[PDB]
């Protein structure tokens, strides 16, 4: 939601908290993600983002909705803004890459 737009407007270090918040999918693969910062093929290729790739849907939704994570209070760097948009800002949910590759693993959170 706007706390992760609050963060965002000053990416200091690599504080994973929004990060760990956000990911509508796998903890341990936003923790990849926070950690690396776009800079991994196995980031956008093998364990990151959420359902927006991934072939199942966890606890935690795609922000798309009921939050807040488009480019608003973001500073503009386009390579950070093209993959953030790549993982949250994705239309097709469920497959489909766009840099690197989406696995279609199957993941049951809860029933």
Same mark, same amino acid.
């Given at each position: #939601?706007?706390?992760?737009?609050?963060?965002?407007?000053?990416?200091?270090?690599? $504080? %994973?908290?929004?990060? #760990?918040?956000?990911?509508?999918? $796998? %903890?341990? !693969?936003?923790?990849?993600?926070?950690?690396?910062? *776009?800079?991994?093929?196995?980031?956008?290729?093998?364990?990151?983002?959420?359902?927006?790739?991934?072939?199942?849907?966890?606890? *935690?939704?795609?922000?798309?909705?009921?939050?807040?994570? $488009?480019?608003?209070?973001?500073?503009?760097?386009?390579?950070?803004?093209?993959?953030?948009?790549?993982?949250?800002?994705?239309?097709? !949910?469920?497959?489909?890459? #766009?840099?690197?590759? !989406?696995?279609?693993?199957?993941?049951?959170?809860?029933?």
């Amino acid at each position: #939601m706007s706390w992760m737009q609050n963060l965002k407007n000053y990416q200091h270090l690599r $504080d %994973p908290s929004e990060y #760990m918040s956000q990911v509508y999918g $796998d %903890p341990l !693969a936003y923790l990849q993600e926070t950690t690396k910062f *776009v800079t991994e093929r196995e980031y956008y290729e093998d364990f990151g983002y959420g359902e927006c790739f991934n072939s199942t849907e966890s606890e *935690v939704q795609c922000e798309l909705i009921t939050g807040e994570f $488009d480019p608003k209070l973001l500073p503009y760097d386009k390579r950070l803004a093209w993959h953030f948009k790549e993982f949250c800002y994705k239309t097709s !949910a469920h497959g489909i890459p #766009m840099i690197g590759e !989406a696995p279609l693993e199957h993941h049951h959170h809860h029933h």
